[PDB]
Amino acid sequence: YRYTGKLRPHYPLMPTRPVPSYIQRPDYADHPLGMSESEQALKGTSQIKLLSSEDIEGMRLVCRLAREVLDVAAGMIKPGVTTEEIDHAVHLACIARNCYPSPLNYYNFPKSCCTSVNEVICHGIPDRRPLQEGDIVNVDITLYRNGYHGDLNETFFVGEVDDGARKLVQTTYECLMQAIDAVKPGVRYRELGNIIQKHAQANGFSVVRSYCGHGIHKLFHTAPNVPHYAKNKAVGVMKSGHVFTIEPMICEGGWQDETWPDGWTAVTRDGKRSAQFEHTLLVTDTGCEILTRRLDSARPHFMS
Numbered sequence: 172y173r174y175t176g177k178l179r180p181h182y183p184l185m186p187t188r189p190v191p192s193y194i195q196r197p198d199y200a201d202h203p204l205g206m207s208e209s210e211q212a213l214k215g216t217s218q219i220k221l222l223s224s225e226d227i228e229g230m231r232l233v234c235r236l237a238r239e240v241l242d243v244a245a246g247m248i249k250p251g252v253t254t255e256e257i258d259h260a261v262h263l264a265c266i267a268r269n270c271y272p273s274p275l276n277y278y279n280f281p282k283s284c285c286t287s288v289n290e291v292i293c294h295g296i297p298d299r300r301p302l303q304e305g306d307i308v309n310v311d312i313t314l315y316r317n318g319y320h321g322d323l324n325e326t327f328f329v330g331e332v333d334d335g336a337r338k339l340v341q342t343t344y345e346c347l348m349q350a351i352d353a354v355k356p357g358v359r360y361r362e363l364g365n366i367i368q369k370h371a372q373a374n375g376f377s378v379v380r381s382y383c384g385h386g387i388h389k390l391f392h393t394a395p396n397v398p399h400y401a402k403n404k405a406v407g408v409m410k411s412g413h414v415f416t417i418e419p420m421i422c423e424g425g426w427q428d429e430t431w432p433d434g435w436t437a438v439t440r441d442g443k444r445s446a447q448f449e450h451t452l453l454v455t456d457t458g459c460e461i462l463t464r465r466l467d468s469a470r471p472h473f474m475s
């Protein structure tokens with residue numbers, strides 16, 4: 172394997188961390204290949220669930236808990252901390268909240284969160300690498316509580332970063348929020364990528380095409396598929412009671428990605444940096460409810 176940048180995996184990884192049996196587990200948790208039978212039964216379907224009142228309450232709770240766990244991770248970001256160390260804290264924080272860390276054994280993913288540094292577009296595996304001053308690092312949190320998943324991520328600065336890091340992360344955040352600001356009943360899912368790509372390209376950046384936002388509720392990933400680039404063919408129209416993520420990945424160079432031998436780590440083919448932000452959104456009668464927002468503070472962590 173020819174690496175695309177300076178980042179390398181730092182092995183060995185700790186043995187997988189158990190989750191106490193009192194915590195409710197998603198179907199894939201005990202599947203030998205981490206397949207989700209429930210997801211697989213709906214593969215290829217475009218139909219989108221209209222959440223009940225009970226569903227909405229369940230999503231509100233799990234997404235609030237997820238935000239709390241991301242905030243725990245945000246508090247740990249400093250030069251010298253390993254991504255494994257972040258992940259262990261996340262794992263314990265999920266357990267403390269009576270939640271299962273959704274990524275754990277999801278299609279055999281080995282850890283409880285995804286940590287994506289510099290050229291990693293997404294799905295980085297926490298490992299022995301200490302964070303370096305100047306890095307950017309994304310932590311992506313997903314929790315499972317009472318049958319519901321809640322999903323969010325933010326990119327953080329490690330100590331002092333360069334102007335390019337600042338511009339990339341700021342623009343990415345703005346892309347997410349411009350998209351969220353457009354969500355309301357009657358808007359086509361395909362419009363979001365037009366908005367994201369417009370702002371990205373105005374700032375000299377590209378939009379990852381291989382990964383998309385997703386429906387989430389009882390399933391971790393389901394309809395709708397929500398591309399973040401322009402002129403996409405996504406199927407569907409927002410309606411009150413729809414829940415889905417928006418999770419744009421934006422790159423300093425070209426948009427092309429490739430995957431490490433680990434089968435997970437997605438990296439820029441050019442080795443330039445990428446940044447991401449994610450919220451889980453509920454479409455309401457007039458707009459949307461940002462289920463994974465901060466309740467206590469105005470801004471994402473990188474502006475705080």
Ligand code: MET
Nearest residue numbers: 274277280285311313322
């Ligand atoms: C290793 S599964 C991680 C998935 C990621 N949280 C997402 O937003 O889809």
Ligand SMILES: [Co+2]
Nearest residue numbers: 311322323449
């Ligand atoms: Co996520």
Ligand SMILES: [Co+2]
Nearest residue numbers: 322416418449
């Ligand atoms: Co997601």
Ligand SMILES: [K+]
Nearest residue numbers: 288289291445
């Ligand atoms: K990154």
